[PDB]
Coordinates of C-alpha atoms and ligand atoms in Angstrom, one line a residue:
Chain U
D1 CA -61.1 102.8 -95.8
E2 CA -62.7 104.5 -98.8
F3 CA -65.4 101.9 -99.2
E4 CA -66.5 102.0 -95.6
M5 CA -66.3 105.8 -95.5
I6 CA -68.8 105.9 -98.4
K7 CA -70.9 103.1 -97.0
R8 CA -71.1 104.8 -93.6
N9 CA -74.6 106.0 -92.8
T10 CA -76.2 104.8 -96.0
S11 CA -79.4 102.8 -96.2
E12 CA -78.2 100.7 -99.1
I13 CA -75.7 100.4 -101.9
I14 CA -76.8 99.0 -105.2
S15 CA -74.6 97.2 -105.5
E16 CA -71.7 96.8 -103.0
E17 CA -69.7 94.7 -105.5
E18 CA -70.2 97.2 -108.4
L19 CA -69.0 100.0 -106.1
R20 CA -65.7 98.2 -105.5
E21 CA -65.2 98.0 -109.2
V22 CA -65.7 101.8 -109.6
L23 CA -63.2 102.5 -106.8
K24 CA -60.4 100.8 -108.8
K25 CA -60.9 103.6 -111.3
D26 CA -58.9 106.9 -111.2
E27 CA -61.5 109.1 -112.9
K28 CA -64.9 108.5 -111.5
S29 CA -67.9 110.7 -111.1
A30 CA -70.9 110.8 -108.8
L31 CA -74.1 112.6 -109.3
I32 CA -77.1 113.9 -107.3
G33 CA -80.0 116.1 -108.3
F34 CA -82.1 118.5 -106.3
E35 CA -85.5 120.1 -106.8
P36 CA -84.7 123.6 -105.7
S37 CA -86.0 124.1 -102.1
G38 CA -87.1 127.4 -100.4
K39 CA -85.0 126.4 -97.4
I40 CA -82.1 123.8 -97.4
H41 CA -82.6 121.4 -94.5
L42 CA -80.7 118.5 -92.7
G43 CA -81.9 116.0 -95.3
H44 CA -80.0 118.0 -98.0
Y45 CA -77.0 118.4 -95.6
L46 CA -76.9 114.6 -95.0
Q47 CA -76.7 114.1 -98.7
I48 CA -74.1 116.9 -99.4
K49 CA -72.0 115.2 -96.7
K50 CA -72.2 111.9 -98.6
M51 CA -71.1 113.8 -101.8
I52 CA -68.1 115.2 -99.8
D53 CA -67.4 111.6 -98.6
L54 CA -67.4 110.6 -102.3
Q55 CA -65.3 113.6 -103.3
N56 CA -62.6 112.7 -100.7
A57 CA -62.6 109.2 -102.2
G58 CA -61.5 110.7 -105.6
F59 CA -64.9 111.3 -107.2
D60 CA -65.7 114.2 -109.4
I61 CA -69.0 115.5 -108.1
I62 CA -71.9 116.7 -110.3
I63 CA -74.9 118.6 -108.8
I64 CA -78.1 118.8 -110.9
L65 CA -80.1 121.8 -109.9
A66 CA -83.3 120.2 -111.2
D67 CA -85.4 123.1 -112.3
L68 CA -87.4 121.1 -114.9
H69 CA -88.2 118.4 -112.5
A70 CA -89.4 121.0 -110.0
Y71 CA -91.5 122.5 -112.8
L72 CA -92.9 119.1 -113.6
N73 CA -93.6 118.4 -109.9
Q74 CA -95.8 121.6 -109.6
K75 CA -93.3 123.8 -107.8
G76 CA -94.3 126.9 -109.8
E77 CA -92.6 128.8 -112.6
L78 CA -89.2 128.0 -114.1
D79 CA -87.8 131.5 -113.6
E80 CA -88.6 131.6 -109.8
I81 CA -87.4 128.0 -109.5
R82 CA -84.0 128.9 -111.1
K83 CA -83.6 131.7 -108.4
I84 CA -84.3 129.2 -105.6
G85 CA -81.8 126.9 -107.3
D86 CA -79.2 129.7 -107.2
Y87 CA -79.9 130.2 -103.5
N88 CA -79.6 126.4 -103.1
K89 CA -76.2 126.4 -104.9
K90 CA -75.1 129.1 -102.4
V91 CA -76.2 127.0 -99.5
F92 CA -74.4 123.9 -100.8
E93 CA -71.2 126.0 -101.4
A94 CA -71.3 127.1 -97.8
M95 CA -71.4 123.4 -96.7
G96 CA -67.8 123.1 -98.1
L97 CA -68.5 121.2 -101.4
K98 CA -66.8 122.1 -104.6
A99 CA -68.6 120.5 -107.6
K100 CA -70.0 121.1 -111.1
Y101 CA -73.4 122.8 -110.6
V102 CA -75.7 122.3 -113.6
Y103 CA -79.3 123.6 -114.1
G104 CA -81.4 120.7 -115.5
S105 CA -82.8 122.8 -118.3
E106 CA -79.3 123.4 -119.8
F107 CA -79.4 120.0 -121.6
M108 CA -82.9 118.5 -120.9
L109 CA -84.7 120.0 -123.9
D110 CA -82.3 119.2 -126.7
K111 CA -83.8 117.3 -129.7
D112 CA -81.9 114.1 -129.0
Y113 CA -82.5 114.1 -125.2
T114 CA -86.2 114.6 -125.8
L115 CA -86.1 111.8 -128.4
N116 CA -84.5 109.5 -125.8
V117 CA -87.1 110.4 -123.2
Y118 CA -89.7 109.2 -125.6
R119 CA -87.6 106.1 -126.4
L120 CA -87.7 105.4 -122.6
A121 CA -91.4 106.3 -122.5
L122 CA -92.0 103.3 -124.8
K123 CA -90.1 101.1 -122.3
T124 CA -91.6 102.3 -119.1
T125 CA -95.1 101.2 -118.0
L126 CA -97.5 103.8 -116.5
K127 CA -97.8 101.6 -113.4
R128 CA -94.0 101.3 -112.9
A129 CA -93.6 105.0 -113.4
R130 CA -96.4 105.9 -110.9
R131 CA -94.9 103.6 -108.3
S132 CA -91.5 105.3 -108.7
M133 CA -93.1 108.6 -107.8
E134 CA -95.0 107.5 -104.7
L135 CA -92.5 109.3 -102.3
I136 CA -91.5 112.2 -104.6
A137 CA -94.7 113.5 -106.3
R138 CA -96.6 116.4 -104.9
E139 CA -99.9 115.4 -103.3
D140 CA -102.6 115.8 -106.0
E141 CA -106.1 114.3 -106.0
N142 CA -105.8 114.5 -109.8
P143 CA -102.3 113.2 -110.9
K144 CA -101.0 114.9 -113.9
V145 CA -99.2 113.5 -117.0
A146 CA -96.2 115.5 -115.8
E147 CA -95.9 113.1 -112.8
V148 CA -95.0 110.1 -115.1
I149 CA -92.7 112.2 -117.4
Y150 CA -90.6 113.1 -114.3
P151 CA -89.1 109.6 -113.7
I152 CA -88.1 109.0 -117.3
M153 CA -86.4 112.4 -117.5
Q154 CA -84.4 111.7 -114.4
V155 CA -83.4 108.2 -115.8
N156 CA -82.3 109.9 -119.1
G157 CA -80.5 112.6 -117.0
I158 CA -78.6 109.9 -115.3
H159 CA -77.8 108.5 -118.8
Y160 CA -76.8 111.9 -120.2
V161 CA -74.5 112.9 -117.4
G162 CA -72.7 109.6 -117.4
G163 CA -72.1 109.3 -113.7
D164 CA -70.5 106.1 -112.4
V165 CA -72.5 106.6 -109.2
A166 CA -76.0 108.1 -108.5
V167 CA -76.8 109.3 -105.0
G168 CA -80.1 110.2 -103.3
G169 CA -82.6 109.4 -100.5
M170 CA -84.5 106.2 -100.3
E171 CA -87.4 108.0 -102.1
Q172 CA -85.2 107.9 -105.3
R173 CA -84.8 104.1 -105.0
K174 CA -87.5 103.0 -107.5
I175 CA -86.4 105.6 -110.2
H176 CA -82.9 104.3 -109.7
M177 CA -84.0 100.7 -110.1
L178 CA -85.5 101.9 -113.3
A179 CA -82.3 103.6 -114.5
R180 CA -80.4 100.4 -113.9
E181 CA -82.9 98.2 -115.7
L182 CA -83.3 100.5 -118.9
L183 CA -79.9 102.0 -119.6
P184 CA -76.9 100.3 -121.3
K185 CA -74.6 101.3 -118.4
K186 CA -75.8 100.3 -114.9
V187 CA -75.2 103.1 -112.4
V188 CA -74.1 102.4 -108.9
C189 CA -76.7 103.7 -106.5
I190 CA -76.1 105.0 -103.0
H191 CA -79.2 105.7 -101.0
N192 CA -79.3 107.8 -98.0
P193 CA -81.8 107.3 -95.1
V194 CA -84.9 109.5 -94.9
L195 CA -84.9 111.6 -91.8
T196 CA -88.0 111.7 -89.6
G197 CA -89.9 115.0 -89.0
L198 CA -89.5 116.9 -85.8
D199 CA -93.1 116.1 -84.5
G200 CA -92.3 112.4 -85.4
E201 CA -95.0 111.8 -88.0
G202 CA -94.3 110.6 -91.5
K203 CA -91.0 111.8 -92.8
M204 CA -89.1 115.1 -92.9
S205 CA -89.9 117.0 -96.1
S206 CA -89.4 120.7 -97.0
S207 CA -93.1 121.2 -97.7
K208 CA -94.1 119.8 -94.2
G209 CA -92.2 122.5 -92.3
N210 CA -91.0 119.8 -89.9
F211 CA -87.3 120.4 -90.5
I212 CA -84.2 122.1 -89.1
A213 CA -82.8 124.5 -91.8
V214 CA -79.0 124.8 -91.9
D215 CA -79.3 128.6 -91.4
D216 CA -82.0 128.5 -88.7
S217 CA -81.2 130.7 -85.7
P218 CA -79.7 129.1 -82.5
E219 CA -83.0 130.0 -80.8
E220 CA -85.1 128.3 -83.5
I221 CA -82.8 125.2 -83.3
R222 CA -83.2 125.1 -79.5
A223 CA -87.0 125.6 -79.8
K224 CA -87.3 123.0 -82.6
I225 CA -85.2 120.5 -80.8
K226 CA -87.1 121.4 -77.5
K227 CA -90.5 120.9 -79.1
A228 CA -89.6 117.7 -81.1
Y229 CA -90.8 114.2 -80.7
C230 CA -88.3 112.2 -78.6
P231 CA -89.9 109.5 -76.3
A232 CA -87.7 108.0 -73.6
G233 CA -86.1 104.7 -74.6
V234 CA -87.4 105.0 -78.1
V235 CA -84.8 105.2 -80.9
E236 CA -87.1 104.2 -83.9
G237 CA -88.7 107.2 -85.5
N238 CA -86.8 109.6 -83.1
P239 CA -85.5 112.6 -85.1
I240 CA -83.3 113.8 -82.3
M241 CA -81.5 110.4 -82.1
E242 CA -81.2 110.6 -85.9
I243 CA -79.4 114.0 -85.8
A244 CA -77.1 112.4 -83.2
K245 CA -76.4 109.5 -85.5
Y246 CA -75.9 111.3 -88.7
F247 CA -74.4 114.7 -87.8
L248 CA -72.5 114.6 -84.5
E249 CA -68.8 114.0 -83.9
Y250 CA -67.8 111.3 -81.5
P251 CA -66.7 111.1 -78.7
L252 CA -69.6 113.2 -77.6
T253 CA -69.8 114.8 -74.1
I254 CA -73.4 115.4 -72.9
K255 CA -73.5 118.1 -70.2
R256 CA -75.9 117.3 -67.4
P257 CA -76.1 118.5 -63.7
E258 CA -74.8 116.0 -61.1
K259 CA -78.4 116.1 -59.9
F260 CA -79.3 114.1 -63.0
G261 CA -76.2 111.9 -63.3
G262 CA -73.6 114.5 -64.3
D263 CA -71.8 114.9 -67.6
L264 CA -71.3 111.7 -69.6
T265 CA -68.9 111.1 -72.5
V266 CA -70.0 108.6 -75.2
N267 CA -67.3 107.2 -77.5
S268 CA -69.9 106.2 -80.3
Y269 CA -73.5 106.7 -81.4
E270 CA -74.0 103.0 -80.5
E271 CA -73.1 103.7 -76.9
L272 CA -75.6 106.7 -76.9
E273 CA -78.2 104.4 -78.5
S274 CA -77.6 101.9 -75.7
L275 CA -77.8 104.5 -72.9
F276 CA -80.9 106.0 -74.4
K277 CA -82.8 102.7 -74.9
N278 CA -82.2 101.6 -71.3
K279 CA -83.4 104.9 -69.9
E280 CA -79.9 105.9 -68.7
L281 CA -80.2 109.3 -70.5
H282 CA -83.3 111.6 -70.3
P283 CA -84.7 113.1 -73.6
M284 CA -84.3 116.6 -72.3
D285 CA -80.5 116.1 -71.8
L286 CA -80.2 114.3 -75.1
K287 CA -82.0 117.3 -76.7
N288 CA -79.8 120.0 -75.1
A289 CA -76.6 118.2 -76.1
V290 CA -77.8 117.6 -79.7
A291 CA -79.0 121.2 -79.9
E292 CA -75.7 122.7 -78.8
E293 CA -73.5 120.5 -81.0
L294 CA -75.8 121.0 -84.0
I295 CA -75.3 124.8 -83.6
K296 CA -71.5 124.3 -83.5
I297 CA -71.7 122.2 -86.7
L298 CA -74.2 124.5 -88.6
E299 CA -72.4 127.7 -87.4
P300 CA -69.8 128.1 -90.2
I301 CA -72.6 127.5 -92.8
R302 CA -75.0 130.0 -91.2
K303 CA -72.1 132.6 -91.2
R304 CA -71.1 132.3 -94.9
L305 CA -74.7 133.3 -95.8
Chain M
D1 CA -106.7 160.9 -90.4
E2 CA -103.1 161.2 -88.9
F3 CA -104.2 160.5 -85.3
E4 CA -106.4 157.6 -86.4
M5 CA -103.7 156.3 -88.7
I6 CA -101.3 156.2 -85.8
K7 CA -104.0 154.8 -83.4
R8 CA -105.0 152.1 -85.9
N9 CA -104.2 148.6 -84.5
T10 CA -102.6 149.8 -81.3
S11 CA -103.3 148.4 -77.8
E12 CA -103.1 151.8 -76.1
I13 CA -101.8 155.3 -76.4
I14 CA -100.4 157.0 -73.2
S15 CA -101.9 159.4 -73.6
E16 CA -104.3 160.3 -76.5
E17 CA -104.3 164.0 -75.6
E18 CA -100.5 164.2 -75.3
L19 CA -100.3 162.6 -78.8
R20 CA -102.5 165.4 -80.2
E21 CA -100.1 168.0 -78.7
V22 CA -97.2 166.3 -80.3
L23 CA -99.0 166.2 -83.7
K24 CA -99.1 170.1 -83.9
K25 CA -95.2 170.0 -83.8
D26 CA -93.3 170.4 -87.1
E27 CA -90.2 168.6 -85.8
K28 CA -91.1 165.4 -83.9
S29 CA -89.3 162.1 -83.3
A30 CA -90.5 158.7 -82.4
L31 CA -88.2 155.9 -81.1
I32 CA -88.3 152.2 -80.7
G33 CA -85.6 149.7 -79.5
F34 CA -85.0 146.1 -80.3
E35 CA -83.0 143.4 -78.7
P36 CA -81.2 141.9 -81.8
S37 CA -83.1 138.8 -83.0
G38 CA -81.7 135.9 -85.0
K39 CA -84.9 135.9 -87.1
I40 CA -87.1 138.9 -87.6
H41 CA -90.8 137.8 -87.1
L42 CA -94.3 139.3 -87.6
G43 CA -94.1 140.9 -84.1
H44 CA -91.2 143.1 -85.3
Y45 CA -93.0 143.8 -88.6
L46 CA -96.1 144.9 -86.8
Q47 CA -94.0 147.5 -85.0
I48 CA -92.0 148.6 -88.1
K49 CA -95.3 149.1 -89.8
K50 CA -96.3 151.4 -86.9
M51 CA -93.0 153.3 -87.3
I52 CA -93.8 153.8 -91.0
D53 CA -97.3 155.1 -90.0
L54 CA -95.4 157.6 -87.8
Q55 CA -92.9 158.3 -90.6
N56 CA -95.8 159.2 -93.0
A57 CA -97.2 161.4 -90.2
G58 CA -94.0 163.5 -90.2
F59 CA -92.0 161.7 -87.5
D60 CA -88.2 161.5 -87.7
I61 CA -87.7 157.8 -86.8
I62 CA -85.0 156.5 -84.5
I63 CA -84.3 152.7 -84.2
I64 CA -82.2 151.7 -81.2
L65 CA -80.3 148.4 -81.9
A66 CA -80.2 147.5 -78.2
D67 CA -77.0 145.5 -78.1
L68 CA -76.2 146.3 -74.4
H69 CA -79.8 145.5 -73.4
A70 CA -79.5 142.1 -75.1
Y71 CA -76.1 141.5 -73.4
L72 CA -77.9 142.3 -70.0
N73 CA -80.7 140.0 -71.0
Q74 CA -78.2 137.1 -71.4
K75 CA -78.4 136.9 -75.3
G76 CA -74.7 136.1 -75.4
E77 CA -71.6 138.1 -76.2
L78 CA -71.7 141.7 -77.4
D79 CA -69.7 141.2 -80.6
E80 CA -72.1 138.5 -82.0
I81 CA -75.1 140.5 -80.8
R82 CA -73.9 143.5 -82.9
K83 CA -73.8 141.2 -86.0
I84 CA -77.3 140.0 -85.4
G85 CA -78.2 143.7 -85.0
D86 CA -76.7 144.4 -88.4
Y87 CA -78.7 141.6 -89.9
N88 CA -81.7 143.2 -88.1
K89 CA -81.0 146.6 -89.7
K90 CA -80.9 144.8 -93.1
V91 CA -84.4 143.4 -92.5
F92 CA -85.9 146.7 -91.3
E93 CA -84.5 148.5 -94.3
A94 CA -86.1 145.8 -96.5
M95 CA -89.5 146.6 -94.9
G96 CA -89.1 150.1 -96.5
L97 CA -88.2 152.0 -93.4
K98 CA -85.7 154.8 -93.7
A99 CA -84.6 155.9 -90.2
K100 CA -81.6 156.6 -87.9
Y101 CA -80.2 153.2 -86.8
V102 CA -78.1 153.4 -83.6
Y103 CA -76.4 150.7 -81.5
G104 CA -77.1 151.2 -77.8
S105 CA -73.4 151.0 -76.9
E106 CA -72.6 154.1 -78.9
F107 CA -73.9 156.4 -76.1
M108 CA -74.9 154.1 -73.2
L109 CA -71.4 153.9 -71.7
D110 CA -70.5 157.6 -71.4
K111 CA -69.6 158.9 -67.9
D112 CA -72.7 161.1 -67.6
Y113 CA -75.1 158.5 -69.1
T114 CA -73.8 155.9 -66.5
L115 CA -74.1 158.5 -63.8
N116 CA -77.7 159.2 -64.8
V117 CA -78.5 155.5 -64.7
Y118 CA -77.2 155.5 -61.1
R119 CA -79.3 158.6 -60.4
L120 CA -82.3 156.6 -61.6
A121 CA -81.2 153.4 -59.8
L122 CA -81.6 155.6 -56.7
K123 CA -85.2 156.5 -57.7
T124 CA -86.4 153.1 -58.8
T125 CA -87.3 150.4 -56.3
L126 CA -86.2 146.8 -56.9
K127 CA -89.8 145.6 -56.8
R128 CA -90.9 148.1 -59.4
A129 CA -87.9 147.3 -61.7
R130 CA -88.5 143.5 -61.4
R131 CA -92.2 144.0 -62.2
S132 CA -91.3 146.0 -65.4
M133 CA -89.2 143.1 -66.6
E134 CA -91.8 140.2 -66.1
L135 CA -92.6 140.0 -69.9
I136 CA -89.1 140.9 -71.1
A137 CA -86.6 139.1 -69.0
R138 CA -85.2 135.7 -70.1
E139 CA -86.4 132.9 -67.8
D140 CA -84.0 132.3 -65.0
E141 CA -84.3 130.2 -61.8
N142 CA -81.8 132.6 -60.3
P143 CA -82.5 136.2 -61.5
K144 CA -79.5 138.4 -62.0
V145 CA -78.6 142.0 -61.0
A146 CA -78.5 142.8 -64.8
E147 CA -82.2 142.2 -65.0
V148 CA -83.0 145.3 -62.9
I149 CA -80.3 147.4 -64.5
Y150 CA -82.0 146.8 -67.9
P151 CA -85.2 148.8 -67.2
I152 CA -83.4 151.9 -65.8
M153 CA -81.0 151.9 -68.8
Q154 CA -84.0 151.9 -71.2
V155 CA -85.6 154.8 -69.3
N156 CA -82.3 156.7 -69.4
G157 CA -82.0 155.8 -73.2
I158 CA -85.5 157.2 -73.7
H159 CA -84.3 160.4 -71.9
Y160 CA -81.0 160.6 -73.8
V161 CA -82.5 160.1 -77.3
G162 CA -85.1 162.9 -76.5
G163 CA -87.9 161.3 -78.5
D164 CA -91.4 162.9 -78.3
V165 CA -92.9 159.4 -78.7
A166 CA -91.8 156.0 -77.4
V167 CA -93.2 152.9 -79.3
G168 CA -93.1 149.3 -78.3
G169 CA -95.1 146.1 -77.6
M170 CA -97.3 145.8 -74.5
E171 CA -94.4 144.0 -72.7
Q172 CA -92.7 147.5 -72.6
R173 CA -95.7 149.1 -70.8
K174 CA -94.3 149.1 -67.3
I175 CA -90.9 150.4 -68.3
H176 CA -92.7 153.2 -70.1
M177 CA -94.8 154.1 -67.1
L178 CA -91.5 154.3 -65.2
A179 CA -90.0 156.7 -67.9
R180 CA -93.0 158.9 -67.5
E181 CA -92.7 159.1 -63.7
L182 CA -89.0 159.6 -63.5
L183 CA -88.1 161.9 -66.4
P184 CA -88.5 165.7 -66.7
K185 CA -90.3 165.2 -70.0
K186 CA -93.1 162.7 -70.3
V187 CA -92.9 160.6 -73.4
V188 CA -96.0 159.7 -75.4
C189 CA -96.2 155.9 -75.4
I190 CA -97.6 153.9 -78.3
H191 CA -98.0 150.2 -77.4
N192 CA -98.6 147.6 -80.0
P193 CA -100.5 144.4 -79.4
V194 CA -98.5 141.2 -78.7
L195 CA -99.1 138.5 -81.3
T196 CA -100.2 135.0 -80.2
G197 CA -97.9 132.0 -80.9
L198 CA -98.8 129.7 -83.8
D199 CA -99.7 126.8 -81.4
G200 CA -102.0 129.2 -79.6
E201 CA -100.2 128.8 -76.3
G202 CA -98.6 131.9 -74.8
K203 CA -97.5 135.0 -76.7
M204 CA -95.2 134.9 -79.7
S205 CA -91.5 135.3 -78.8
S206 CA -88.4 134.7 -80.9
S207 CA -87.2 132.1 -78.4
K208 CA -90.4 130.1 -78.3
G209 CA -90.0 129.4 -82.1
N210 CA -93.8 129.8 -82.6
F211 CA -93.4 132.6 -85.2
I212 CA -93.5 133.3 -88.9
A213 CA -90.3 135.0 -90.0
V214 CA -90.6 137.7 -92.7
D215 CA -88.1 135.7 -94.8
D216 CA -89.6 132.2 -94.3
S217 CA -90.1 130.2 -97.5
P218 CA -93.7 130.1 -98.9
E219 CA -93.8 126.4 -98.0
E220 CA -92.8 127.2 -94.4
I221 CA -95.5 129.9 -94.2
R222 CA -98.0 127.4 -95.7
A223 CA -97.0 124.6 -93.3
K224 CA -96.9 127.0 -90.3
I225 CA -100.3 128.5 -91.0
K226 CA -101.5 124.9 -91.8
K227 CA -100.4 123.5 -88.4
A228 CA -101.5 126.6 -86.4
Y229 CA -104.1 126.9 -83.7
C230 CA -107.3 128.2 -85.3
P231 CA -110.5 126.7 -83.8
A232 CA -114.0 127.2 -85.4
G233 CA -115.6 130.5 -84.3
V234 CA -112.7 131.3 -81.9
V235 CA -111.3 134.8 -82.3
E236 CA -109.5 135.2 -79.0
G237 CA -105.9 133.9 -79.0
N238 CA -106.2 132.9 -82.7
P239 CA -102.9 133.8 -84.5
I240 CA -104.4 133.4 -87.9
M241 CA -107.2 135.9 -87.2
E242 CA -104.5 138.2 -85.7
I243 CA -102.4 137.9 -88.8
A244 CA -105.6 138.8 -90.8
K245 CA -106.3 141.8 -88.6
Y246 CA -102.9 143.3 -88.6
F247 CA -101.3 142.5 -92.0
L248 CA -104.0 141.9 -94.7
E249 CA -105.4 144.5 -97.0
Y250 CA -109.1 145.0 -97.4
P251 CA -111.2 144.4 -99.5
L252 CA -110.0 140.8 -99.1
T253 CA -111.2 137.9 -101.3
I254 CA -111.1 134.4 -99.7
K255 CA -110.9 131.7 -102.4
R256 CA -113.0 128.6 -101.7
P257 CA -114.5 125.9 -103.9
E258 CA -118.2 126.3 -104.8
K259 CA -118.6 123.0 -102.9
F260 CA -117.9 124.9 -99.6
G261 CA -119.7 128.2 -100.3
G262 CA -117.6 129.7 -103.1
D263 CA -115.3 132.7 -103.0
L264 CA -116.3 135.5 -100.6
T265 CA -115.2 139.1 -100.4
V266 CA -114.8 140.9 -97.1
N267 CA -114.4 144.7 -97.0
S268 CA -113.2 144.8 -93.4
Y269 CA -111.6 142.6 -90.8
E270 CA -114.7 143.2 -88.7
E271 CA -116.8 141.5 -91.4
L272 CA -114.2 138.6 -91.4
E273 CA -114.5 138.4 -87.5
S274 CA -118.3 138.2 -87.9
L275 CA -118.2 135.5 -90.6
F276 CA -115.7 133.5 -88.7
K277 CA -117.6 133.6 -85.4
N278 CA -120.8 132.7 -87.2
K279 CA -118.8 129.6 -88.4
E280 CA -119.7 130.7 -91.9
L281 CA -116.0 130.6 -92.8
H282 CA -113.9 127.5 -92.0
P283 CA -110.4 127.6 -90.4
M284 CA -108.8 125.8 -93.4
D285 CA -110.2 128.3 -95.8
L286 CA -109.2 131.2 -93.5
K287 CA -105.8 129.6 -93.3
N288 CA -105.3 129.2 -97.1
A289 CA -106.4 132.8 -97.7
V290 CA -104.2 134.2 -94.9
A291 CA -101.2 132.2 -96.1
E292 CA -101.4 133.3 -99.7
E293 CA -102.0 136.9 -98.9
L294 CA -99.2 136.8 -96.3
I295 CA -96.8 135.5 -99.0
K296 CA -97.7 138.3 -101.3
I297 CA -97.0 140.9 -98.6
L298 CA -93.8 139.3 -97.3
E299 CA -92.5 138.7 -100.8
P300 CA -90.7 141.9 -101.6
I301 CA -89.1 141.9 -98.2
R302 CA -87.8 138.4 -98.7
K303 CA -86.6 139.5 -102.2
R304 CA -84.2 142.1 -100.9
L305 CA -81.2 139.7 -100.6
Ligands
LIG1 N1 -86.0 113.5 -107.7 C1 -85.1 114.3 -106.9 C2 -84.6 115.4 -107.7 C3 -83.7 114.9 -108.8 C4 -83.7 115.7 -110.0 C5 -82.8 115.3 -111.1 C6 -81.9 114.2 -111.0 N2 -81.2 113.9 -112.0 N3 -80.3 112.9 -112.0 C7 -79.7 113.0 -113.3 N4 -80.2 114.0 -114.0 N5 -81.2 114.7 -113.2 C8 -82.0 113.5 -109.8 C9 -82.8 113.9 -108.7 C10 -85.9 114.9 -105.7 O1 -86.8 114.2 -105.2 O2 -85.6 116.0 -105.4
LIG2 N1 -86.7 146.3 -74.0 C1 -87.0 146.2 -75.4 C2 -85.7 146.6 -76.1 C3 -85.4 148.0 -76.1 C4 -84.1 148.4 -75.8 C5 -83.8 149.8 -75.7 C6 -84.7 150.8 -75.9 N2 -84.3 152.1 -75.8 N3 -85.3 153.1 -75.9 C7 -84.5 154.2 -75.8 N4 -83.2 153.9 -75.6 N5 -83.0 152.5 -75.6 C8 -86.0 150.4 -76.1 C9 -86.4 149.0 -76.2 C10 -87.3 144.7 -75.7 O1 -87.9 144.0 -74.8 O2 -86.9 144.3 -76.8

């Protein structure tokens, strides 16, 4: 089922009923935007996977390589950001997604767009805009005006592109709630879960260096998985369990010596969850399985580059 | 000075006198070998730097891309090793090293070469060979015959290539002592220091994932440096200090707020060592300086792609 395929592994859909209505349409577009990242990690991959899920559902996909937004979010100069964006496009392409790749600054500085940003700036309170940026803005002891221009420019972007659907992590939630509230056409929002960092603290961001990159070496992957936070019986905030939930193909065979129970096949992540919670499967065996299967999945991607 | 340039930042030279005698030669070669690595780190860079030092001293440089040795050291199949080796050549070339690059298997399987390995297998005791491999061999509960073939094959390689100088990390010391005992011609051995891991525990290897890759994103570098072991007034086993010693140019300016002492200029690593031990320079400020300067240095390398 197309609905359940798209719903699978999302934190929320705003709204489920509106999504149904968009599925009855032949031509339908979905959008996502990315601040260019120095290294594309699993969070990105999780989202690109959802875009492919949407594509296989008949959606035309649009990727905003958000150079301006990165500029506004203190990620350095536009010219170096556009390079990183190009590298990000190449990493996406390797993941097996065909879409329209658009740099933000291609349409985000035109007279009328700018005018509409200011139109929305009249409609958005400073407090509302600052709240929408809590999980997106760079840490700054002295928040810049640029921080509050960011959300309105994304909302306008959403308007300009004209996507039936907008996709992002749960960090994007508040900006999307804004978009729905302020624009004539309400966009259907699909929000993906925020992966936990490898050491287990906070969440997994590109600036925290707590991630598995899609082109990391098999030795890195094994070392990162090996080092990672993964307490016995604990599913919540466990990044290894998350990688098992969001990336791995089931049925999954976990190779273990007979000394420690022997190999065990699991038909579903729920089964794995169950076995892990009641101490039936040790973290180190979970880790080795996840690490090897992750390599097998990330292998074609690492090769292309 | 040429000798002092070559000596700069080495753990040892075997021997200093023998190096001098090689310096009076017009034609002189220096070799180093590498087990192909999925990611090229600072440990590699430190050595390629030393190879450039020798290059500028009038040394024809030979790089052995040791595919066979990696095969013997359980790094997987030969065909995939050769690819990683190719990628390794690309990184070395980016470091601005022009030299002869050679896959081990190009000459390490010829009748006479093999015969000479066996001639040496007859001269080398199992205990001696196992000892030479303590810091090189992959961890194994059940050590393989391949482990002890490795060191004799490197010695024979050293002999075959005919290099005046052999260069490597301190892990290669014992195998080099062997080569000097067993071969008609004694090779001058230049051993580079082994860099500490970012968590401060054990040396930095490409399989412990405790390293900074030369092509890491500026944010990874910043997060890696940020998380790294670097205790107040502690120089020994401090990777950040080591990075400062082996990679940074002097005079060095360390940017700090006037609140914490203001910017300070150091004209030598020694001065830095002093300031750090005196606790006159804080870890965080050391880190921030080291990270920004490390980016500037690793920038053009990362650019070649
Ligand atoms: N805020 C997103 C980036 C992002 C940038 C731009 C856009 N859109 N959507 C329509 N037009 N531009 C969406 C997300 C982040 O945290 O990476
Ligand atoms: N044992 C070195 C690799 C290495 C391999 C081969 C060679 N040579 N030298 C001459 N002929 N082959 C040197 C080092 C490591 O631990 O990476």
